[PDB]
Scaffold this active site. Structure first.
Site, PDB file in Angstrom:
ATOM      1  N   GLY A   2      49.323  29.417  28.421  1.00  0.00           N
ATOM      2  CA  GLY A   2      48.051  28.844  27.961  1.00  0.00           C
ATOM      3  C   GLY A   2      48.006  28.871  26.438  1.00  0.00           C
ATOM      4  O   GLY A   2      48.357  29.875  25.819  1.00  0.00           O
ATOM      5  N   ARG A  17      54.051  24.402  32.152  1.00  0.00           N
ATOM      6  CA  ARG A  17      54.627  25.404  33.064  1.00  0.00           C
ATOM      7  C   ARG A  17      55.908  24.923  33.708  1.00  0.00           C
ATOM      8  O   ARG A  17      56.041  23.743  34.047  1.00  0.00           O
ATOM      9  CB  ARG A  17      53.640  25.801  34.167  1.00  0.00           C
ATOM     10  CG  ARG A  17      52.424  26.568  33.676  1.00  0.00           C
ATOM     11  CD  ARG A  17      52.202  27.897  34.383  1.00  0.00           C
ATOM     12  NE  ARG A  17      50.821  28.364  34.256  1.00  0.00           N
ATOM     13  CZ  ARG A  17      50.332  29.061  33.223  1.00  0.00           C
ATOM     14  NH1 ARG A  17      51.102  29.388  32.192  1.00  0.00           N
ATOM     15  NH2 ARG A  17      49.058  29.427  33.225  1.00  0.00           N
ATOM     16  N   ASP A  65      53.014  37.362  27.819  1.00  0.00           N
ATOM     17  CA  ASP A  65      54.136  38.201  28.268  1.00  0.00           C
ATOM     18  C   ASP A  65      54.935  37.539  29.403  1.00  0.00           C
ATOM     19  O   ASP A  65      56.116  37.830  29.588  1.00  0.00           O
ATOM     20  CB  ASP A  65      53.714  39.652  28.560  1.00  0.00           C
ATOM     21  CG  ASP A  65      52.639  39.751  29.605  1.00  0.00           C
ATOM     22  OD1 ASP A  65      52.237  38.703  30.149  1.00  0.00           O
ATOM     23  OD2 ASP A  65      52.123  40.838  29.946  1.00  0.00           O
ATOM     24  N   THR A 106      48.373  34.200  22.902  1.00  0.00           N
ATOM     25  CA  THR A 106      47.467  34.125  24.043  1.00  0.00           C
ATOM     26  C   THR A 106      46.123  34.704  23.606  1.00  0.00           C
ATOM     27  O   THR A 106      46.080  35.648  22.811  1.00  0.00           O
ATOM     28  CB  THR A 106      48.031  34.917  25.280  1.00  0.00           C
ATOM     29  OG1 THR A 106      46.977  35.147  26.230  1.00  0.00           O
ATOM     30  CG2 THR A 106      48.433  36.331  24.873  1.00  0.00           C
ATOM     31  N   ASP A 121      44.136  36.416  25.466  1.00  0.00           N
ATOM     32  CA  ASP A 121      43.729  37.514  26.351  1.00  0.00           C
ATOM     33  C   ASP A 121      43.928  38.949  25.861  1.00  0.00           C
ATOM     34  O   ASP A 121      43.329  39.883  26.421  1.00  0.00           O
ATOM     35  CB  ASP A 121      44.429  37.359  27.716  1.00  0.00           C
ATOM     36  CG  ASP A 121      44.124  36.049  28.363  1.00  0.00           C
ATOM     37  OD1 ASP A 121      42.966  35.593  28.276  1.00  0.00           O
ATOM     38  OD2 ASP A 121      44.977  35.392  28.978  1.00  0.00           O
ATOM     39  N   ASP A 174      46.518  40.814  26.467  1.00  0.00           N
ATOM     40  CA  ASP A 174      46.890  41.544  27.688  1.00  0.00           C
ATOM     41  C   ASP A 174      48.368  41.905  27.713  1.00  0.00           C
ATOM     42  O   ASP A 174      48.972  41.998  28.788  1.00  0.00           O
ATOM     43  CB  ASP A 174      46.508  40.737  28.934  1.00  0.00           C
ATOM     44  CG  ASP A 174      47.233  39.407  29.033  1.00  0.00           C
ATOM     45  OD1 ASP A 174      47.951  39.011  28.086  1.00  0.00           O
ATOM     46  OD2 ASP A 174      47.156  38.674  30.042  1.00  0.00           O
ATOM     47  N   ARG A 231      14.371  36.718  28.895  1.00  0.00           N
ATOM     48  CA  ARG A 231      15.319  36.395  29.963  1.00  0.00           C
ATOM     49  C   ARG A 231      16.509  37.356  29.917  1.00  0.00           C
ATOM     50  O   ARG A 231      16.892  37.841  28.842  1.00  0.00           O
ATOM     51  CB  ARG A 231      15.842  34.971  29.754  1.00  0.00           C
ATOM     52  CG  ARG A 231      16.343  34.250  30.985  1.00  0.00           C
ATOM     53  CD  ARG A 231      15.218  33.581  31.767  1.00  0.00           C
ATOM     54  NE  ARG A 231      14.772  32.308  31.200  1.00  0.00           N
ATOM     55  CZ  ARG A 231      13.531  31.831  31.312  1.00  0.00           C
ATOM     56  NH1 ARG A 231      12.591  32.531  31.936  1.00  0.00           N
ATOM     57  NH2 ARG A 231      13.217  30.661  30.788  1.00  0.00           N
ATOM     58  N   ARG A 257      41.559  36.611  31.618  1.00  0.00           N
ATOM     59  CA  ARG A 257      42.455  36.662  32.778  1.00  0.00           C
ATOM     60  C   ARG A 257      42.162  37.970  33.521  1.00  0.00           C
ATOM     61  O   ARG A 257      41.057  38.126  34.027  1.00  0.00           O
ATOM     62  CB  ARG A 257      43.929  36.484  32.369  1.00  0.00           C
ATOM     63  CG  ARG A 257      44.873  36.127  33.525  1.00  0.00           C
ATOM     64  CD  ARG A 257      46.295  35.894  33.078  1.00  0.00           C
ATOM     65  NE  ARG A 257      47.266  36.428  34.031  1.00  0.00           N
ATOM     66  CZ  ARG A 257      47.875  35.715  34.972  1.00  0.00           C
ATOM     67  NH1 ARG A 257      47.626  34.412  35.104  1.00  0.00           N
ATOM     68  NH2 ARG A 257      48.746  36.310  35.785  1.00  0.00           N
TER      69      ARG A 257
END
Lengths: 319, 319, 319, 319
Positions: free
Chosen positions: C11, C72, C103, C125, C127, C129, C162, C171
């Protein structure tokens, strides 16, 4: 320890409010009462001190500036102001103080500590010019403010095959200039901590021009000289299509970035915790990517080291 | 008519690319071939002319500057450059030209039209200084750029109870200053089209100070004087805590706003349609909130009228 | 080693372009020829490989996405694709490859290395991660994108008293949620790595409501459940005035922040240097605030550790 | 007339605060006393009414939301609430009311007027769905919020050759969708006011794909169907690489744009002036690029007309 004071001192920076919030809320979570002190050490001497409830720090995390205000006070360095501030502290039952500001304000935190009012220095300044810390609150936001402004300069420069000389802030520190310079692909970066060579910069720009590049950019830390002054020197070495801008005080404002808000929150929390364990005379900051603290005395013997390797890196990146 | 040319001339502005896109795509939808002309009238004379396919205007709508480049050409006003540009036009089979730029570039559109190459002027400039149009492409974006910068100035001003004098762009037009001034709650706005009174401004600031206001702001169109020059005059009438900033060329760049992108698209489309119906020597713009066109000749006899009522409005709003 | 390849895989993330730029320019400064590989490992197998000149990486540093494209390719994990990619590498004389991605793409860097084409993994990325790195390129920008969006949510939430439940990306990693949650003063943060208690969160919101707070916010990592799903569970424990939003793919785009542009530049440079000294099979990243590298094999045995102390911190800050 | 009230009603919008500021300051400049009314017509009935001094509207012009709060009140339409609100009005000596909200709140302005409390409706809503006005306060900001978000979507879509279906707000009005759609070069725009053809949209996307376009975008007004629902229908006509996002309540927040701040200031001033000349039961807005007013009764017989020509324009621009 039952009551703590908070003040912001020196030039304001985005994220100061997030720090006040973090100190106030972490202190209240640990059974302490919190008091705001307005106009830095100036209002401390004047007695502009008021209770800060948890609800009073709502809607502040995203807000620039300091809602407590900042203001310069020379006489607080002297024993006249010290005693007057201390009397005011005693008047409101305050036991300890968190000082949010530049390393200049750390002097006041130390004096307070020496008089029996344990204090923590918290780095709030855009300049990143404080020893023993890799980051100060406001720095990331100033860098973003300058980057976004210079991106716009790059747009107009490119349409016209123009060279721009641009001053960024920093006081006597080149950290903003290097970081923003790399982020904006400057042809050259000019800082107080490392030598520069106008003729060499001129050669860079000439070569780039020959290679078909449609814009030029020199980022000049305000601590070296004005953009006008650099442009004048540059024009000696070649005939360039050049303009000079000074970004100015916009670099001090704007909603704080994610990094500044989190940094302010971590450091504010750390300050309260240090105070809870009976510490004083400490400055908190970032080393090796983690939160650390040092005796304020130790900072007064040291100098901020910036990431000067960025100059060598940008030497390759600028074509 | 089978082939059309596009050029951008004068100082660049956010949304020029969206205009080129709109002209190119609307022209191709109507069976025309499109050619880019680089470096304004300068590249026209040089013959820097190339085919623009529909795919070539992808990923441009959100992009600042002009990808065709802009560049000044004095000799195009003269018959020397005219004939040379015309020969280049004939070389590439171009029948008509869309000229994106300021009212200065409209001269070239008219000369082209007089030589049998029907042309349309499209307002691309941040200044909003063109007769018979209430908007030029780039104006809304410059206003946003200046507003966002001055918001940041207001943050730092407020922390310190500071007055700021701030130059915005505009050339000789006060439109940016008034609009941004109102949007940023300036204490006073200073423009070339309407008288100002430094002493009166000083009185405003004094009264505000007395009323507890924690910031001051005077927005000065660059067409009047520099921020430094205004600050110097102001200091004669009172002792103020004041700084002066000049926003600079950032006002010319940045991704175009929703209004600028839509405006550029409407006007680009209108230009192509005017050309399709065999018109030439026209400038397109906005009047009474709608797209209109006028003979370029008629603009040369008129002056841009800005919304000066904003000064009277801001007189009430500034406290 | 004479020629190097660059690809982006997985991504996309803001700052990938700055990384390609940095790799290309640092490689060319060290006498190497550079080749772009489009559509990640997919185009590698297809042979979509072309020479990248220094001029070809101009006007990229500030540009989101990957100009090389990402796509991909399952068969590259298998020996079928490996050999096909390798044949393509040999066809263009490429000796080494920098792989910019998550990764997941590091697997491909390792396989390449094992086949005699030394490769470096570079973390691109949003993320954060990836094991052994505290930052990935795109992460700071995603955090800013989410923060700015949620600031706007806080504006509308406050006008209406609210509660908002908001999904952010990540992810299976809670890093974005924690950092953005703290930055936006969320009442609660919900992540995959640490237990949460819906009833306890409901109690927080109830207490805040009683204390006069005019907004609520729960930041839910997409890896836990959807905002709709959390809201449904919350409604079991109390009657709240609540809405649910999912921020979505905006978190993957936007111009990269100052930190992302500098990070991409540092890591791209490091990758080239590692290759120059004859290294391969390494992933570069950030540990203890500095640039480090590790054998890719070692990452496959480890897990990313996020800053979970932020949950304890935010527990105090949320009132 | 000596005292006026201000309330914000219905869904909040960026620039409401600038309107309260403008009403308050223009009223005070004309010798009137000003009172804030919290929680719209709900707090009017509750008696949540307080004096608004000029200093109380400082630091509001740039602030999103409504600091007075908004809240729904069904019983105010009925005579029960009317009389209760009126008694509260009389209690505080208020003679007239400015109502900032959507055309729904205009009902309350009319009822108030009929009971001897002259009132003006001021358009504060992001939707631009009010008859006899081309703009409502908040609309430009929502458009910018959506544009900036979708720009980011376009970045990630392009890296991956992805089609995105994106919901924007608007309630039952397609104005945001058309304006944002054009600004973001959507392949198609889908609105409640004009027919759409899913098969035709699919054909557009197919042709674009064939022509080498690296992204797709369909902007769907929330008033038609959800992005998920549109995506499902689209998938019937072709095999697309597609995702669906719903932007959500971020469109209601954020600092107001230059246009929204100026619009709010003009309209707030106009409201006060109308009241000063003894008018009531009027709604103010923008027609033919100028400030106008109409009897609220006349709006109840009409419908908002949007700029549907944008669909025809975008038909040419989308390739």
């Amino acid at each position: 320890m039952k009551r703590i004071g908070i003040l912001t001192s020196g030039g304001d920076a985005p994220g100061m409010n997030a720090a006040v919030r973090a100190v106030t809320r972490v202190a209240i979570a640990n059974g302490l009462e919190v008091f705001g002190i307005r106009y830095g050490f100036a209002g401390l001497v004047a007695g502009d001190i008021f209770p800060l409830e948890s609800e009073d720090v709502a809607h502040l995390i995203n807000v620039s500036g300091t809602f407590l205000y900042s203001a310069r006070y020379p006489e607080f360095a002297e024993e006249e102001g010290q005693l007057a501030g201390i009397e005011q502290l005693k008047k409101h039952g305050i036991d300890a103080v968190v000082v949010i500001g530049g390393d200049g304000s750390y002097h006041g935190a130390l004096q307070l500590t020496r008089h029996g009012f344990n204090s923590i220095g918290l780095p709030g300044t855009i300049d990143n010019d404080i020893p023993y810390t890799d980051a100060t609150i406001g720095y990331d936001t100033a860098c973003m403010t300058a980057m976004d402004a210079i991106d716009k300069i790059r747009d107009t420069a490119s349409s016209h095959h123009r060279v721009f000389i641009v001053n960024v802030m920093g006081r006597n520190c080149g950290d903003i200039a290097m970081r923003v310079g790399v982020a904006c692909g400057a042809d050259a970066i000019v800082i107080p901590e490392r030598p520069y060579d106008v003729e060499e910069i001129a050669n860079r720009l000439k070569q780039a021009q020959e290679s078909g590049k449609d814009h030029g950019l020199v980022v000049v830390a305000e601590g070296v000289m004005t953009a006008d002054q650099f442009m004048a020197e540059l024009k000696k070495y070649g005939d360039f299509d050049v303009r000079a801008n000074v970004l100015g005080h916009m670099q001090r404002g704007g909603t704080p970035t994610v990094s500044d808000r989190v940094l302010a929150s971590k450091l504010g929390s750390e300050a309260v915790h240090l105070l809870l364990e009976g510490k004083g005379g400490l400055a908190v900051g970032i080393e090796n990517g983690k939160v650390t603290s040092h005796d304020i005395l130790d900072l007064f013997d040291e100098s901020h080291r910036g990431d000067y390797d960025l100059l060598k890196l940008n030497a390759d990146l600028s074509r």
